[PDB]
Design a protein around this ligand. Sequence first.
Ligand SMILES: *[C@@H]1O[C@H](CO[C@H]2O[C@@H](C)[C@@H](O)[C@@H](O)[C@@H]2O)[C@@H](O[C@@H]2O[C@H](CO)[C@@H](O)[C@H](O)[C@H]2NC(C)=O)[C@H](O)[C@H]1NC(C)=O
Ligand SMILES: *C[C@@](*)(O)[C@H](CCCNC(N)=[NH2+])NC(=O)[C@H](Cc1ccccc1)NC(=O)[C@H](N)Cc1ccccc1
Ligand SMILES: *[C@H]1O[C@H](CO)[C@@H](O)[C@H](O)[C@H]1O
Ligand SMILES: *[C@H]1O[C@@H](C)[C@@H](O)[C@@H](O)[C@@H]1O
Ligand SMILES: [Ca+2]
Lengths: 252, 96
Amino acid sequence: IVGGKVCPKGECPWQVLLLVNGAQLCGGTLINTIWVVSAAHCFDKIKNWRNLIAVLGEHDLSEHDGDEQSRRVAQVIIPSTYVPGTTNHDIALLRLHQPVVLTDHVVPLCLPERTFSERTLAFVRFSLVSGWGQLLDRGATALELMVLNVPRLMTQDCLQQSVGDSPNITEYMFCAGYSDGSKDSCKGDSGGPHATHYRGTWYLTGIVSWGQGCATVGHFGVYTRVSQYIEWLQKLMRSEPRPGVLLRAPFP
Amino acid sequence: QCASSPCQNGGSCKDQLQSYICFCLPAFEGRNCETHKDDQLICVNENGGCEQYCSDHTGTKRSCRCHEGYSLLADGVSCTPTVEYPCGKIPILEKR
Ligand SMILES: *[C@@H]1O[C@H](CO[C@H]2O[C@@H](C)[C@@H](O)[C@@H](O)[C@@H]2O)[C@@H](O[C@@H]2O[C@H](CO)[C@@H](O)[C@H](O)[C@H]2NC(C)=O)[C@H](O)[C@H]1NC(C)=O
Ligand SMILES: *C[C@@](*)(O)[C@H](CCCNC(N)=[NH2+])NC(=O)[C@H](Cc1ccccc1)NC(=O)[C@H](N)Cc1ccccc1
Ligand SMILES: *[C@H]1O[C@H](CO)[C@@H](O)[C@H](O)[C@H]1O
Ligand SMILES: *[C@H]1O[C@@H](C)[C@@H](O)[C@@H](O)[C@@H]1O
Ligand SMILES: [Ca+2]
């Protein structure tokens, strides 16, 4: 996160930390006790899947304080339309081997009914994005959960304030942030929630996906448009478990 | 009966029985065409009042349901948790 604030311990209960053999790999969003949403590109270059861990109730990575809860990722499900190396459809549903225990510091974010997300959630001006990713484009990752409040933009305005060969914003994505080089999500936050508040409840609306560097003057940050994956996600959670560690479930 | 021009907002009146019928312009609804689109009680106007979800393509009126772990309340619009930790409420500020 660039130009963000430390998330007061307890204020980002759905935040998830993803580790690969102890190393920080990405963020994630708790949506149920065995299910976290994250981003497909986090899994682009993984050789060992038994060392993939999710940590919930995390806050300060340099100190253990007992609210941390870890679970090995049993499986990663990505859209069959995703292609490693390109940014479209950047989303993943991860299944925890054993549930986490909801606690004061551990709560899922709601996965909103699609139509509400498109009719109402999409017009809420600001939303929170959070993570332990780099605090600068080639800077250090955080030690403590950082959180940021970014305003959403219609895609037609996304480049108005600005490399022809940068990724193209598709319909499975949206823009949010600031174009003055001050604030944005950054490397390492991928998969963290872009959360939106509406009448006292917080709902998942986007996933940190990518950007031109981080907080690059002239550009904004790009997030995965969760509303297009609601049914997709719902159906995978309500179906019977499937064997495998990496699954390309049909999309839609 | 169509003499007292009951049909508001340029509605078209027609005498029926000892009363009348108002045939309303596209944008207006009601007995007398009294309410406008942007004032109606459909889902596009502020989530028709509902705190969480809304529906209105099944004719007569609009309903307001809730997300798992929540239940509708008296008024037909508000919602309340039905579990300890419902999705998307930050317990530490919920207690504060
Ligand atoms: C983002 O898109 C642009 C251009 O968009 C047009 O690209 C055409 C190839 C075609 O698919 C049309 O649907 C589309 O809307 C990309 O630039 C183009 O790059 C291609 C090669 O990849 C060149 O042949 C073109 O000269 C060039 N045109 C323009 C206007 O730039 C760009 O590749 C793409 N970004 C990524 C990462 O693919
Ligand atoms: C996986 C991550 O943690 C991370 C988050 C970065 C978000 N950036 C901003 N400004 N909010 N995402 C990336 O690092 C992605 C990786 C990737 C994503 C999808 C598919 C494949 C790989 N890469 C980037 O963000 C690039 N800098 C995007 C890019 C911009 C311009 C030209 C070429 C690439
Ligand atoms: C005039 O039109 C009818 C006459 O039948 C009356 O009932 C309405 O209330 C009035 O505006
Ligand atoms: C009835 O008559 C005229 C005056 C028009 O306004 C119509 O559309 C209406 O139904
Ligand atoms: Ca800790």
